[PDB]
């Protein structure tokens, strides 16, 4: 009776909710928290005891009576609620930061946006300013990794766009590759991003690319649920022998809003994908099969500034893989680990988000960077497909080797082989030409652009 009344006033505050996945989220310390192995509901009961009248607060000091109140609470929670539906809100440990504005909400204002994830650190408005003498050093670091030159113009913009999208709690349709040689600043960029978003950043394994995602317990993919930034590192030169290729099957799966995969000792097979997936590379990736659906999901950022020791500087100024060579800063790595640039980089990310990802958040691919897509890109501009616009032109097509078969358009295999040998040699694309012939095999409905 008395412990039933206490449980009712707790649900009157809407401080505990039931989610569609069966989790009980609680509102403690200005944040929605959930944990499958922690007593969070009884934690809320003890914390909320100050907002109760005098006769009710004294009965919440007994752990046994807090379990009775908790048992009452779980019986009254019959309907689920939707959580994490605002993509333009950045949730901290003590509130939610609006990204369309610079406003910070802490209290009942941040409760409306049921963000069950958070960075894990309290937001500091005294460091989220602009001037911030650490911000000068951060500008020095960023302007070295991605120089502000005319040559590094579209690459710098892509770099800013990709890092900014890690603040958006929506589904991202592209996978970005951080490509560069050694000592170029990719790991520095990763460590700066991890310092700025905290627990919203997760580091995952290499399986999520090169193996099936649903073959039993796969914690390496179930840990990406509601994470806004996923990093994979150091693909082991898949173009060489003894390697498993990228398996473009997973590339399309990782783009979908829902990724199938379950943790250990649980049946939750659906995870929500809000993550910008970035892979650090020293070599360009190679895929098992190249498809137009694969070239629509790949972007590449190039790192071309080398940070070297004074001894081996001259060996780096004569390398074609570097555009600039700079002194390595030995204390920079330890300063990032101490979250010195935690809020300056966050201010940078918010500014870039306002510049790029408003009002529509979307990541666009760069097919012209991957060498594996060169054949498909060339064929896309080399051939016209079938018919309809060419039937009246067949009078002029009697010459130039064009013949008629099946009454649409045809080309003999030998004719097409000889013609395609005149645009690019088979030294590097011989297997590619053979694969195209086999996949589109005899007659070939394809017309050259110059013969129109």
Ligand X SMILES: Nc1ncnc2c1ncn2[C@@H]1O[C@H](COP(=O)(O)OP(=O)(O)NP(=O)(O)O)[C@@H](O)[C@H]1O
135 versus 232: smaller Cβ distance to a copy of itself: 232
Residue closest to 429 by CA, chosen among 378, 385, 381: 378
Considering Cα of 215, then 216, then 219, then 225, what sign does the dihedral take?
Answer: positive
Site mask, ligand X, residues 392-431, x = CB under 6 A? ----------------------------------------
Q: Quick one: how far is CA 115 from the chain centroid? A: 19
What residues numbered 266-295 form the site for DNA, per CB under 7 A?
A: 266
Site mask, ligand X, residues 255-294, x = CB under 6 A? ---------------------------x----------x-
Task: Give 134's Cβ-side CA count (13 Å radius).
Answer: 18
With H, G, I as helix, E, B as strand and everything else as coil, classify residue 96: strand
By CB under 6 A, name the one of 7, 90, 115, 183 that touches ligand X: 183
Q: How far is the CB of 146 from a copy of itself (least distance, A)?
A: 19
Task: Please choose, out of 63-71, 103-111, 262-270, 277-285, the segment that lies near DNA by the rule CB under 7 A.
Answer: 262-270
What residues numbered 209-248 form the site for DNA, per CB under 7 A?
A: 216-217
Task: Please choose, out of 8-16, 137-145, 365-373, 398-406, the segment that lies near ligand X by the rule CB under 6 A.
Answer: 137-145
Residues in contact with ligand X, counted by CB under 6 A, come to a total of 21
By CB under 6 A, name the one of 119, 176, 184, 250 that touches ligand X: 184
331 versus 392: smaller Cβ distance to a copy of itself: 331
By CB under 6 A, name the one of 52, 202, 286, 328 that touches ligand X: 328
107 versus 310: smaller Cβ distance to ligand X: 310
109 versus 203: smaller Cβ distance to a copy of itself: 203
Contact status, residue 344 vs residue 127, Cβ threshold 8 Å: yes
Q: What is the DSSP string of 433-452?
A: HHHHHHHT------EESTT-
Rounded to the nearest 10 degrees, what angle do helices 63-76 and 2-12 cross at?
60
- Give the C-alpha separation, 350 to 164, whole Å: 7
421 binds, among a copy of itself, DNA, ligand X, none (CB under 5 to 8 A by kind): none
Q: How far is the CB of 131 from a copy of itself (least distance, A)?
A: 27
Considering Cα of 376, then 377, then 383, then 389, what sign does the dihedral take?
Answer: positive
- Give the C-alpha separation, 288 to 219, whole Å: 25
148 binds, among ligand X, a copy of itself, Mg ion, none (CB under 5 to 8 A by kind): none
Q: Say how many Å lie between the first and final Cα of the chain, rounded.
A: 87
Residues 6+ apart with CB under 8 A from 424: 378
97 versus 251: smaller Cβ distance to Mg ion: 251
**Could you tell me where the DSSP H helices lie in 321-425?**
332-337, 342-356, 374-382, 413-420
- Residues in contact with ligand X by CB under 6 A are 141, 144-145, 180, 182-188, 252, 282, 293, 296, 307, 326, 328-329, 332-333
Give me the residues that bind Mg ion (CB under 5 A), please. Answer: 187
């Amino acid at each position: 009776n008395k412990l039933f009344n206490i449980a009712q006033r707790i649900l009157d505050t809407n401080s505990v909710l039931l989610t569609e996945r069966g989790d009980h989220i609680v509102w403690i310390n200005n944040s929605w928290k959930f944990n499958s192995e922690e007593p969070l509901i009884t934690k809320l009961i003890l914390s909320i005891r100050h907002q109760l009248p005098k006769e009710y607060s004294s009965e919440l000091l007994c752990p046994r009576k807090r379990k009775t109140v908790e048992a009452n609470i779980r019986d009254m929670l019959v309907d689920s609620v939707e959580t994490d539906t605002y993509p333009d809100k950045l949730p901290f440990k003590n509130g939610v930061l609006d990204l369309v504005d610079g406003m910070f909400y802490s209290g009942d204002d941040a409760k409306k946006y049921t963000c069950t994830v958070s960075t894990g650190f309290k937001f500091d408005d005294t460091k989220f300013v602009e001037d911030s003498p650490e911000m000068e050093e951060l500008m020095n670091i960023i302007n070295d990794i991605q120089p502000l030159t005319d040559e590094n113009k579209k690459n710098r913009e892509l770099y800013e766009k990709t890092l900014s999208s890690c603040l958006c709690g929506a589904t991202k349709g592209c996978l970005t590759f951080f490509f560069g040689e050694t000592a170029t600043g990719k790991s520095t960029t990763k460590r700066l991003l991890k310092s700025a978003i905290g627990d919203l950043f997760v580091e995952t394994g290499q399986t999520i690319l090169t193996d099936v995602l649903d073959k039993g317990p796969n914690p390496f993919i179930a840990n990406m649920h509601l994470k806004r930034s996923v990093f994979c590192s150091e693909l082991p030169d898949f173009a060489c022998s003894g390697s498993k290729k990228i398996r473009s099957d997973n590339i399309k799966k990782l783009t979908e809003p829902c990724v199938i995969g379950r943790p250990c000792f649980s049946n939750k097979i659906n995870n929500r994908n809000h993550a910008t997936i970035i892979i650090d590379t020293n070599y360009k990736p190679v895929f098992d099969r190249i498809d137009n659906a694969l070239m629509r999901r790949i972007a590449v950022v190039r790192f071309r500034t080398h940070f070297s020791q004074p001894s081996g500087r001259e060996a780096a100024e004569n390398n074609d893989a570097y555009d600039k060579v700079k002194l390595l800063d030995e204390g920079l790595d330890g300063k990032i680990q101490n979250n010195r640039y935690r809020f300056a980089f966050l201010y940078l990310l918010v500014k870039w988000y306002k510049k790029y990802h408003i009002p529509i958040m979307k990541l666009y691919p760069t097919p012209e960077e991957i060498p594996d897509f060169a054949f498909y890109l060339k064929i896309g501009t080399l051939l016209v497909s079938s018919s309809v616009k060419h039937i009246p032109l067949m009078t002029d097509l009697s010459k130039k080797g064009y013949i008629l078969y099946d009454n649409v358009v045809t080309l003999p295999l030998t004719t097409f082989q000889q013609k395609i040998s005149k645009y690019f040699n088979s030294r590097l694309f011989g297997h590619d030409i053979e694969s195209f012939i086999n996949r589109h095999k005899e007659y070939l409905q394809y017309i050259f652009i110059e013969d129109i």
